[model samples]
Target: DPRPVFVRELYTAGISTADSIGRELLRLHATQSEGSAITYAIDWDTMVVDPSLEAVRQSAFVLNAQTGVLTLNIQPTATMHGLFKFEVTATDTAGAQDRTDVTVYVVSSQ
Candidate 1:
């Protein structure tokens, strides 16, 4: 059995934010330290090409597939609560891939 290019267990990030009083909830709070790896932008043409990506989109949150910045198109209500997760992928020219998980915890701003 040949080994896979990327390891399943890599790194994870957990961030803290609040329900928008109406803002982009914009951009990722922390810059990834893994690279200096990956590209600034990603594929957004489809809602998602990977299973891990659907988590944010299903909730109406959009991560800048290009730069990894996030957008909450609508202000969330009380129902919009708790922890949400997203993934970022960086593929090098050689086709090697690295993945990272970003977790956001949204609290009620009211």
Candidate 2:
């Protein structure tokens, strides 16, 4: 590995007001100072969830490894309102890896 890949902070908009129709939640991207290429993957082993809400889980979200796009897929219900923390890892062709934490907060404001 020439250098470790750096996964940038994922970007998102209107996460506080997501819907069931399936929307583009967050966009993932990484950078490598010197490497062949980088591949993205979700580190499901390190996923974190709150105790207050007990409905939405990993299945509620979708991450496109190739495109580096994370999407939410849960109904905006009261039970699904909480915080979901997970990590995204970016690996280089040489096996160098780096990751960043992502927090998804769902809420129902009426």
Candidate 3:
């Protein structure tokens, strides 16, 4: 059973702006001799959002499975400042799977 290696990446986004849009915040980095294609997806069930941002958590972020790109869709508001955490799973064609946690920090542009 060859399992893919999971990699974690930390990303930061500013409030009240689209500066973090279309950025490659996290990517699936795995090394195995299986020579198979690896795909990634965010595990929604395990996502953890700050209680401060619970009201507007639906539109907070977006993840691309095939391209492995994460987009921040946080609205412009001070109350939306917090941390969004989630896990991403990488699956290979051979059915091998691995998961990694990623954190997105929302900061004030002070």
Candidate 4:
């Protein structure tokens, strides 16, 4: 069994949910021969965070499997502020899976 190495793991993306250009907060990174159909998705069941920041609607967070991208929906109000913790599951074509924690920082600038 082989695994993809996170050669240049997507470091971190912190943004103001109100910013128009703040579409995707984070994009995962990995290396697996380059041509592999490897994909990623958030581990909803395993991802958790301090209740202090549930202020923002849970649905405000979005994860794209095909693009390994996480988008922070623009919340006009009630946006939470904190270091939300989460993990993404990367699955290979063979069904082998690898998980990695994602560091996302959300804040309000007003």
Candidate 5:
């Protein structure tokens, strides 16, 4: 088993608002030194594919370099509320990957 040579931090924003058509941003940061380029992915409820399966609208983005942050935009509809899961993975250029998961609650803006 290979251990991580560095540690990373992850954060989520846009949770306290009562808006229906808003954007949710996620941020990832490297806290340890000595690492190569980072790649990331966001999985919604154990699925990496588009949320079109559930008729939910979702989009993800990796913003900035070296900082390793991600921004996920979620536009909720009347049918898109409840406990949803979000998992983020970070991998170095050498194929080393680390992942973390988070749960968020969405309420109707009605």
Candidate 6:
């Protein structure tokens, strides 16, 4: 099967659940060729610590072919406090792929 693969801008939001910390809402906008399925994965630790991509959590979200968007909510624990990194990898059934990385800061309200 031959299909085109592409990933669009990725976005994230921090939601404070309590006064201590909050949750991370991550999203990716993408489009794939017809008759294709897109799968994604994230490397949170590596992106946050690395200078190239400073991120705070690891997450993954698959795009809905019909919608062309992927959304994921990340819940962080006490162990996840501080700066972090993240990277996304997307692949389609046709073998087409895409990747992106970013950095984030996680802190306690205090």
- Worst 10-residue stretch by lDDT in candidate 1? 1-10
Error in Å for residue 33 of model 2 = 3.3
Model 2, range 20-87, lDDT digits (tens) per residue? 54687877777777745777788979778776444556676788876778877666565545678878
Q: Which scores higher on TM-score, 1 or 6?
A: 6
Backbone clashes (count) for model 5: 0
Report the lDDT tens digits of candidate 1 across residue range 1-110.
Answer: 21112333322323224434234554432233333333423233333323332444465566554454555554544444556554656554344555555454555464
Q: Tens-digit lDDT track for model 4 on 8-36?
A: 43456666645553377767765566446
Ranking of models by TM-score: 2, 3, 4, 5, 6, 1
lDDT of 3 by residue, 1-110 (tens): 67777554433434444455455554457665677777878788978888987875667767776666776654546556677777778888888888777777776664
Which is the leading candidate under lDDT?
2
> Where does model 5 exceed 4 Å of error?
1-24, 43-45, 48-53, 57-74
On residues 46-68, what C-alpha lDDT tens digit does candidate 5 reach at each position?
Answer: 63432432444244233434554
User: RMSD to the native, candidate 1?
Assistant: 7.9
In the order shown, the candidates' Cα RMSDs to the true structure are: 7.9, 2.7, 2.8, 2.9, 4.9, 6.1
Q: What lDDT does each candidate get?
A: 0.44, 0.69, 0.67, 0.65, 0.48, 0.47
lDDT of 6 by residue, 12-73 (tens): 43332242322224455446657567776564344544232224323422334444344433
Name the best candidate (by TM-score). Answer: 2
RMSD of 6: 6.1
Ten-residue region with minimum lDDT total, candidate 6? 15-24
TM-score (C-alpha) between model 6 and the true structure:
0.51
Clashing pairs in 1: 41-66, 42-65, 42-66
The TM-scores, one per candidate, come to: 0.47, 0.77, 0.75, 0.73, 0.56, 0.51
Higher-scoring candidate on TM-score, 3 or 4? 3
